[PDB]
């Protein structure tokens, strides 16, 4: 919440998973989009975004192709 | 996603007469129900359109043009008189009548409420730092929160209830503009500030700078002497360990002079027994109108021998 | 996700309700309505201290009409349904937190102390008519520090449906601290005193005991940190209905120093030694006096857990 | 809805997929978190949770590794 305390689970609007390959390392970023006016003005979780959240489990698949 | 991502919410956006007024609006712009007592103590943010619901519309028959744009224009232009008479004196909303520009003591309270989240959202953010217009006994002043640059534009985020919003008298958040008049102490075998007896001095003020601060009748005067640790930012001893009021007797050229004689042996010497009981204590002199009114005029918080 | 999961919503939140009201907006509000449902002009100061009867359609005039664009389904029927279903939270969030009418903002569920006043005001005809009748007897919803309780006026049967006839001003309606009309629900934990050449409650000195509480029933009443505690001992005639010594002739706060099995234990040692003996000089100055022990959180908060009001030697 | 009727689809806040292996059987549990104040006070869909809901299709992947 805006006062820094832990509030209820806000409602959700979107999830973005982004990945880019650079020299033998896959770089994965995430952002969970939630209702605004709940998160503080600045920080990791700010405005309408939870940036690279721990509240997310994803399965990473790898394979090779030509 | 980039940082431009934004969503709908359970919170009012920013894009009428009823029976839940005005408390419904206060929660809608973020006032917590735990602190709704301030809903009638502080107005809607002057930066937002809802504040101006109170006036007759600018298109209606015979109505004054009252908008947040015309508000911001006069605010930055320094036309502080036009705000009081056209907007402040005709607000009269939120069931409150004594809307005024906040005092320094009230801005002091507003910052504490903003930091502790007791206000609306636009104002919980607004009163953290900045330069704010204040008003004490018909006189405008600018106070600084956070030591911001002096070219920061003047902010009037909200008007407050004259009596309903309680001010905080300690000066911590809102740093004011205290006036120190150019004054000469004549010293020699005359002025004396040394332990073991009475403190006496004889100052001298300039007439042209007395008339700039509302002092044209140069006998409508009275003096106060303070003993204690002066404020680190403005230099005033706000809560002195020893306070003493004295009256003057002086009668010269293109400037005028005033004496001062503490009563230390026509009462307890204790001025010297407390001024010189702690090495950080200093003695400061304050000039008022005869009844304690007027622009407060301050001397330096002097050390021993006016140092 | 576990059962503690809770979310925001669109039905008991903001952004839905708009600046509108299904009631009539006028210049004699709300005092005309207060008189019209029977509040005497001699007691019109309570017009803003207690709401319109939740049993009547007028109470719901404050909200946007249920048919207008964007309104929540709010009616006296939906209120009573949630009431008898025990959904007190939805009442607080959907109705109470958004009443905001009668020019009063601090609308809350009445406390136990406030129902006590409401019964006195109802009997003395100082309320509206429907509420002058309602608060005579029945089971009433109360709320103290975020905790719901049911209080009983007149000793009615336990299966009487819960009544919330009106909400009150948190600070405007003054409560009565004496327990006469509204009888509450005090909690007595099952505890063992070890006695022997240990626990002692006899005249002539300091009172000491060593109890023992169970962990599983401490966690049911919000006590999982078994060192976040503090103790109070009371001396006087306990209440004839609940057994608590609400106004003891002698009150004393003490702190414990105990550390065993599937339960945990706590001591207690009165300071009656090396000061005035007067605990025993007042506990045994009247044969009807009894000694009672109370457990709170460290700062006096939490569900108040009470021991029996003991006679001499824990009898 | 709390009144027993079937209403519109409530808004969503989270989905949890949890799995536990016990004696050659994977026990799969799920929970869909939705806006509260719509579900009844008790039941499978209650409070703010749709417990192991049918309104969910998930793809189950299995493999073995050392």
Swiss-Prot record, chain B:
Keywords: Cell outer membrane, Membrane, Signal. It is found in: Cell outer membrane. GO terms for cellular component: cell outer membrane. InterPro entries: TcpF, TcpF_C. It is a peripheral membrane protein. Pfam families: TcpF. Involved in TCP pilus biogenesis. May be a channel protein. This is Toxin coregulated pilus biosynthesis protein F. It comes from Vibrio cholerae serotype O1 (strain ATCC 39541 / Classical Ogawa 395 / O395).
From Swiss-Prot, chain C:
It holds the Pfam family TcpF. The keyword Membrane applies. Its main location: membrane. Keywords: Cell outer membrane, Membrane, Signal. It is a peripheral membrane protein. The keyword Membrane applies. Coiled coil: none annotated. It comes from the Bacteria. GO terms for cellular component: cell outer membrane. It is found in: Cell outer membrane. Involved in TCP pilus biogenesis. May be a channel protein. This is Toxin coregulated pilus biosynthesis protein F. It comes from Vibrio cholerae serotype O1 (strain ATCC 39541 / Classical Ogawa 395 / O395).
